[PDB]
Amino acid sequence: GRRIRVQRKGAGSVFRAHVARRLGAAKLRANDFAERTGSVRGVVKAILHDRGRGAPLARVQFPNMRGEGRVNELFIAPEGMYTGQEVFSGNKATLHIGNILPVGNIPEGTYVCNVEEKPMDRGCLARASGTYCLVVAHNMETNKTRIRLPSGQKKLISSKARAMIGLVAGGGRTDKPLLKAGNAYHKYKAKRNCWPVVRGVAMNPVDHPHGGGNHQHIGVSSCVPRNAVPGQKVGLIAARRTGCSGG
Amino acid sequence: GAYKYVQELWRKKQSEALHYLFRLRTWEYRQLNAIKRCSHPTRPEKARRLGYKAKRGYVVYRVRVRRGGRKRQCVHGISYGKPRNIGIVGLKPSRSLRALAEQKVGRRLPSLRVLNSYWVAQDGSYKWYEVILIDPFHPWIRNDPKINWICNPVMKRRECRGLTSAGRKARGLHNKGIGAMKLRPSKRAAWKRNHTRSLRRYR
Amino acid sequence: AGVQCTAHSWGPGRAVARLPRKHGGIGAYANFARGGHMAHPTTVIRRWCRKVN
Amino acid sequence: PGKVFNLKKGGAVVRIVRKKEERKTKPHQEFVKSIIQECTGMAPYEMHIIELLRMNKDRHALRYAKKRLGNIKRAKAKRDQLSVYARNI
Amino acid sequence: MGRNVAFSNMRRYKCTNKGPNLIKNWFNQPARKIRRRQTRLQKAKAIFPCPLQKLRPSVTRCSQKFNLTQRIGRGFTLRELQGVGLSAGKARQIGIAVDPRRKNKSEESVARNVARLKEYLSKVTIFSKQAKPEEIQQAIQHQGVVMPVVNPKPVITTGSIAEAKKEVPENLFMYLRNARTARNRARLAKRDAEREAAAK
RNA sequence: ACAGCGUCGCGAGGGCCGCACCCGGCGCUGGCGCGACGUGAUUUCUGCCCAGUGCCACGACCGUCACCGUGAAGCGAUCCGC
RNA sequence: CCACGCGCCGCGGCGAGCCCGAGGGAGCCCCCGCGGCGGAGCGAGCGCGAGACGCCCCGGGCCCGCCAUGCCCCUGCGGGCG
RNA sequence: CGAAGGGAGGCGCGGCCCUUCCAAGGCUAAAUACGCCCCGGGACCGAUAGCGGACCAAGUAGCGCGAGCGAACGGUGAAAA
RNA sequence: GGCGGGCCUGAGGCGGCGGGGGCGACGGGCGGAACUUAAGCAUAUCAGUACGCCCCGGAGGAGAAACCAACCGGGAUUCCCC
């Protein structure tokens, strides 16, 4: 047989992210003494576009607490933030869109984004266009806060973890049809070599497990076990159920 | 005669006293680099037995070796061939970790010569062995009848040629008589002599 | 002698003979070939000395 | 059969080379073992055998000793040494 | 081609064209004898009075196949040395090899070797107290094994039939046969005794 | 191939790959995401079948199903239970 | 073709013997020089162990070992005889 | 997992002997092996042979992106007369 | 909380010296095939070979018994004959 496309992808080499001309790593401002007690004030210098990200980014300039200059942070932009806004990242921060406060401080029912999976992780959950997490409940004895991830799954994260108030901007980007293959090529060129996609039933027996016969058929069931081998997991992995259904 | 007592204390390794010392030593050796120079032998009694003398030109270096069996370097885990040679993860190393340690500290310091190695510590992933290395060109070593043998050029890189005790253990020379009859000058040299076809002039 | 050349047969289908040929098609490694090894090369292991009681 | 059959084997006198005053370890080695026992104690395996010796008798103790050590002779020797501590308690 | 052919016990040639070189030609035989003679001649010249070979002991050839023959051994035991009153250093300095590993194993060996040392000590002449050149030049190097061990050829002695008859039992063959089978005849007896206990 | 259309897995103490090992790629990523697949724009629809074979159960533990550990016997190798 | 192993045939020397083994001899066509093989076989072994004839060949007869079976007796699951 | 008197004696295991040695440290000459290169010799080959290469420039001329591949070519006469 | 000194662990420099790389053989250490033979082919064989890597020296390696034996015993190693 031949190594399949999935196997060839993990060595990078042509399938590595097209990261040239990307602004930088969008991350929440680092936790600092002035964040832990009180709030640091930043000004949104610019709202720009990341090459591979649908959501707009934002250059917010905070003062340098450590020294004498000014430090620039790159943040995923909540909708409604504007150039020349004053954004406060702190334990004592007001509940306005853009501000970063610890999740215990954030009240229940609040739309939050760029939430930290664990305190001082500088950003993890709810970072894509339109996506948000909501505060569900706070256990003040366990210092833990339940949040609902955009998937629906409920995660108990430390009350110390920080989040930016608001819903990420770029909302409703996938509503528009791509319409042409060309529009897809332009989107993927800013991302990685994953497009165009050839179906395995199109490929010859060597190239893919679905492979090929006199007629294009999946042969055995597409469902594969979770404990498949690395070149064998190709169809629906560990499917609990398959098929279109109600709900 | 203090050393009779320290040999006895090192026979009782599981003791609570030496288990504590062995745990602090190992937590510390973990925090250091693999090949580290030790100013003094951490085991003065065992070093003395293997030939260490506290003179200029005698040096002790601790080398940390990873614990476990060998995995064959065959790409994609495949050794194409007859079925007997298809196996990559259950192999056991041919040379002990004591010997691997000497060979590793021999490459790191090719100028010096390797006398012998003693065990200092062990953990679940790493065993630490300490090696005594001699500077062949130091005046004290050259002008010493006892250790001037190492200065001879034939003793250059002894651990590369399996002449150290650990290397000679692997070659089976620690054994004599039955079982060691086909591995004396060398396993290969016995094979050559045994399989040589001697065509004498009068045959 | 005759075996330091690198010669492998061109094979059937080139209208040549099947003997080992070099890069240009020069015949090699064969008693018949010019520069080929002897078919059975002389050896120094021959018994030269006979035994008399 | 390793010996040839000669019913009259012994046609020369034989040097009686044996014994050489067979000796023990010596008091000084015993005195070193004591000093180290006082500041070391017993290993865990030895302590487990001592408990089997106090109750569970010896089949268990010699089975544990042969697994912990590797020879019946060494195991029996360990059981016989550890017995004094167990019997005194 | 077949018929009755004893089968071969020859092994197939290994490393014939590639490998260690498992062929030893002996064309270097005539010239190895010459080189070895020259090395002995040059070593001999380097110590003119001294013989090339040290006195070595007379030792029984090992095994029952050669029990009654003697050969030369590595060196004299320290008991053999005490019979002539010589230390290991003095013995080696006067050309008698010393083996501290050898143990005599018999009273006879010590006496045979002690006798051999006495012959050598009488034969050896020590040139000391200033080398008198004409007398050191006069000395003759002994060549070959010093006192080579001789295995006397067997001889036929004479005996009285009557004295011999007392020494052996009548039916020696039965006596010999009773001895060969004694352990087995006793094991079968012990086994039979148990089969009897089965009745009770 | 394609846009569209489904299906699947996965919340990073992860998924999928690379990979002799040390370590990597997706990932400067974060579910409007990433990986895996089918079908192949619209327009209109996609029926019945979970026996078989896959796949999935914080779906049970039924029957089986190992080292280890633990008993019993033995002079011990061992053997028999659990 | 050459080496090596085996079978058989012829030939030469010597004969219950036979043999430039490796080697050593200020010596390498000279001298000296072990195993080995043959001389006893048969049985898994413990072990036991050949004469009765005969140009030669074949056969019979008988002896030895292995296997059975009687009988007698020492130093006895041993010896003798069949 | 981890001994203290321990190892071996060409069928394991337990006992009892007997013979025989002392591992877990080190050194060491000699006899032995062998190419390049030098030196001699041969029942060797005699220019399609002998080294691929006897030719004043052979691993050269040439070929291949490269790793690599790889030739052919001796003789006037006594004297250039 | 500083301020010196001894020990110990390290850090930077400077001086003296040493290492490195080469050799189509011999030698030591490792990683390690397959064609092949089995008239197929898995164990086996080829072969503890080719080849890759490391390391010396004029030799190297081995080497003064935790040896062999079973005797009317021997006695480090290497090499040859068997």
From TrEMBL, chain A:
GO terms for biological process: cytoplasmic translation. GO terms for molecular function: RNA binding; structural constituent of ribosome. SMART domains: Ribosomal_L2, Ribosomal_L2_C. Pfam families: Ribosomal_L2_C, Ribosomal_L2_N. GO terms for cellular component: cytosolic large ribosomal subunit. Residues 10-89 form the Large ribosomal subunit protein uL2 RNA-binding domain. Gene3D superfamilies: 2.30.30.30, Nucleic acid-binding proteins (2.40.50.140), Ribosomal protein L2, domain 3 (4.10.950.10). This is Ribosomal protein L8. It comes from Giardia intestinalis (strain ATCC 50803 / WB clone C6) (Giardia lamblia). The lineage of its organism: Eukaryota, Metamonada, Diplomonadida, Hexamitidae, Giardiinae.
TrEMBL record, chain B:
GO terms for biological process: cytoplasmic translation. This is Ribosomal protein L15. One of its GO terms (molecular function) is RNA binding. InterPro entries: Rbsml_eL15_core_dom_sf, Ribosomal_eL15, Ribosomal_eL15_CS, Ribosomal_uL23/eL15/eS24_sf. It comes from the Eukaryota. The keyword Ribonucleoprotein applies. Pfam families: Ribosomal_L15e. It comes from Giardia intestinalis (strain ATCC 50803 / WB clone C6). Keywords: Ribonucleoprotein, Ribosomal protein. PANTHER family: LARGE RIBOSOMAL SUBUNIT PROTEIN EL15, RIBOSOMAL PROTEIN L15. Belongs to the eukaryotic ribosomal protein eL15 family. PROSITE patterns: RIBOSOMAL_L15E. GO terms for cellular component: cytosolic large ribosomal subunit. The keyword Ribonucleoprotein applies.
Automatic annotation (TrEMBL), chain C:
Mg(2+) binds at L19. Belongs to the universal ribosomal protein uL4 family. This is Large ribosomal subunit protein uL4. It comes from Giardia intestinalis (strain ATCC 50803 / WB clone C6). The chain holds residues 54 to 106 of 316 of the full protein.
UniProtKB/TrEMBL annotation, chain D:
Keywords: Ribonucleoprotein, Ribosomal protein. One of its GO terms (cellular component) is cytosolic large ribosomal subunit. One of its GO terms (biological process) is cytoplasmic translation. Pfam families: Ribosomal_L36e. One of its GO terms (molecular function) is structural constituent of ribosome. InterPro entries: Ribosomal_eL36, Ribosomal_eL36_sf. The keyword Lipoprotein does not apply. The keyword rRNA-binding does not apply. Belongs to the eukaryotic ribosomal protein eL36 family. This is Ribosomal protein L36e.
